[model samples]
Target: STGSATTTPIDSLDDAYITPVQIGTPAQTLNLDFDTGSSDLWVFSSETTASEVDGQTIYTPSKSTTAKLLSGATWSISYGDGSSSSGDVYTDTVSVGGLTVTGQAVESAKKVSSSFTEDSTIDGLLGLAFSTLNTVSPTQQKTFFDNAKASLDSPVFTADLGYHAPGTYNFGFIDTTAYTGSITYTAVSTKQGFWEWTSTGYAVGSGTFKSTSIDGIADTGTTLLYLPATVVSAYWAQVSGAKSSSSVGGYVFPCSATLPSFTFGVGSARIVIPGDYIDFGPISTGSSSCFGGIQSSAGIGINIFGDVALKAAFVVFNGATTPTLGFASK
Candidate 1:
């Protein structure tokens, strides 16, 4: 089976992208973030204590005849941004685009952190990462993609993210019509439950391409590209007025400063991020300073090729025994 889904920016726009999904027998539709960084299909639910929920939509399992409680199962997750959620588990029919997976483990949130509660737009996260990272307890759960892969025409998914525009996530098949040029494939190291790969090096604008191997994950859920402190410092150094600011909590520079393009090595291909993209808008509304999209991942201990970096190219997340990432210009 092959399927495709339309991915649109959250109404707020810069935060993340969302796609529509159907759950349960009666088809309770919800907008979910397709996160490749973490695994677990979780949702805001009726099980979520009223006190823990804000304005988010809740999935009432009781209303779906096909929903089955997974006795004694539970899950909890914390994100890099400090947002977290924990909940009970249930088995239900889950559908995305045109693909359906019966008996899919659906984690129902019992409690959500203020970060999640305050953001009413994201109903929950549909993890596209490997099932090994699933958070369910008692027995680990499989991701929707994993469960449906066997029946799919091809065990692959493609991400086509756009800047301030709509994109498409194609599953089980590749649509040649979505991208341009030949796709350059690079070997993936999934030892950490991520689509991890090592880059030959990076460059600042027209500068020489440094030959340092940098290991990182392709995480669509994350908003910004996070790199090593030394790397981040090196890139920001090229910006005339950029500095590491504790007040803004990252590298920031005057909005008027002309910035340089940032480029990454993907095997033999180089993915270049425009200077405007590096300038992550303004620090705050009407502020003279702007936060750099490329920041130091000091505590995370892993480099993240977040939306800012991934959106520049068409990406193929190949889920083979020897997984590979294919990149092409769109």
Candidate 2:
């Protein structure tokens, strides 16, 4: 990933889309997230009108030397966080690390709201987590990655975030620079786009989840980890003053003490989530504590591991290797 004119597509089974060749800028970088569940590249722009900001570079096709806009098709997106934006479709010749993808789909939103515009530092969001249960094509174009995978060098993408803030969150490279452990992987389920998984049980600190070996789906779309109530309750039991309160609908824990660490087993590999991810108390209520990770959404059925979880693991999506995903130490 060290060079001038880049020329490689980031490939990791963990990543559904080849991150947009052009991530964020001096303002933001489109890092990999379990965002495949939805579509749209959330970027800041000078044209943003809904919220107040110091003015950031929003992707403008007209400005780029290599950008194109689709006239008839419209681009609209809604985030689970209660934000939405839409406009015309535009493509740009962008660069990411050593990879270059011409005419990459870029959404030009005429309107924007939610936390996006509130934070001056928060620039854009690139959806690369998972595919949408809903799609645009009469048949395809459902997820951005699905459309871009064909041309990607390895037909896959991976994410690395434990390094330099801007450089660590790279788009299409395996990021051999960040890989530090023996690689291990899990087979991906063909089930639509949901990051579906089965759990074994639970463990605190650095141990395995589920003795039979708990297996869970990896996704970036969700912002928190959604696990079963039983496991959720167990995690709370390990914490001091941890109790479920009605305030936030999840367990609230005293933030003063260090929270317990937890790990998820994928095949033979174990991915650990640190305590910082579970310090939930800034939130007052809930059956699950407001920890670095939370479990109030257990009743929803499917366990979803979102941004918080993904950021902790150096994930790789290997579509070509197998319907499997690879996990290496970040």
Candidate 3:
């Protein structure tokens, strides 16, 4: 069986896409950020401290007779963005779209950082990363996708992150109608528990496409494109009125500037990010300056192909043996 669902981006925020998911018996539903960067299905739950529960909905496992505690098992995670969540474990039925998985490990958040509590729109996170990356202690847990893949007609899922619009995430099936042309496949290096791949360099606007190799990961949870500082500097050089702003901590430019397009090479496929997309909206509310979506990946060490980059193409995250990534224009 296959299932496909709409991914809705937060209004005015436009950073991440969220989808509805059901947990436990009787199905207590919540809007969850479908994150490919990490592997842990964590939720704001009854275990959460009252102080940590802002306007977010909480999942009550005790309400479901079928819920089972893992007995001393716990899970904790810290993200590159400095957000963290940790909690006890419970096994329950979880459903996304029409696909359901029984005995799924649901990490009930006991404590969450201000990063999470501040975003009340997101009740939790549904991790779509490899099960091996799960943060459960003692025995790692399998993600909903990992547990449900065996019953799927094909062990595959596609991420179609749309810009300023709703996108679809198709599971157990690939919707050819969602993309154009043939998909170019690239072998993924999962050593870092991410969908990591190497790009054959990139170019600013219609400029020459360089041949240098750059390593990066496709991360849905991240909001911007992060590349080497030199690469970032070279791209911004093509844009008039663009500068490295220590105040913004990234490249910023006049809102009216005509920014140049950026392209990244995956195998033979050339994925292009339009110039307009480079203008990551105004740097701040009512400001005349705009921040560049592409930034330096120096501190993080590894580069990231975040929503700013991913939304430009239709991505196939093949979970079959020897994980691979397939990309095509949308």
> Model 3 off-target regions past 4 Å?
none
Per-candidate total of colliding backbone pairs = 0, 52, 0
Tell me how far the alpha carbon of residue 72 in candidate 2 is from the true structure, in angstroms, after superposition. Answer: 1.3
Task: Tell me which of candidates 1 and 2 scores higher on TM-score.
Answer: 1
| Candidate 1 C-alpha lDDT tens digits along 118-156 | 888899999998999999997999998899888789899
C-alpha lDDT score of every prediction, in listed order: 0.89, 0.54, 0.90
Give the TM-scores of the predictions, in the order they appear: 0.97, 0.75, 0.97
Off by over 4 Å in 1: 11-13
Worst 10 residues of 1 by lDDT: 7-16
- How close to the true structure is residue 117 of candidate 1, measured as C-alpha lDDT? 83
Q: Given candidate 2, what's the lDDT at residue 37?
A: 49
Ordered list by TM-score, greatest first: 3, 1, 2
lDDT digits (tens) for residues 76-117 of candidate 3: 999989999999999999888888889999999999999899
lDDT of residue 241 for candidate 3 = 86
Candidate order by lDDT, decreasing, is 3, 1, 2
- Give the per-residue lDDT of model 2 (tens digit) for 1-330: 221221112222121222323532221234332254455554555445645444444554555655555556565667655676655555564445555545556556566665545534334555554545432233223344555567665556665543113224343446676667766766676475544454444477754456654445566555567776777787778877887766566677765768877776666666677777655345534434344466756555566666546666777766563456777656
- The residue-level lDDT of candidate 2 at 101 comes to 47
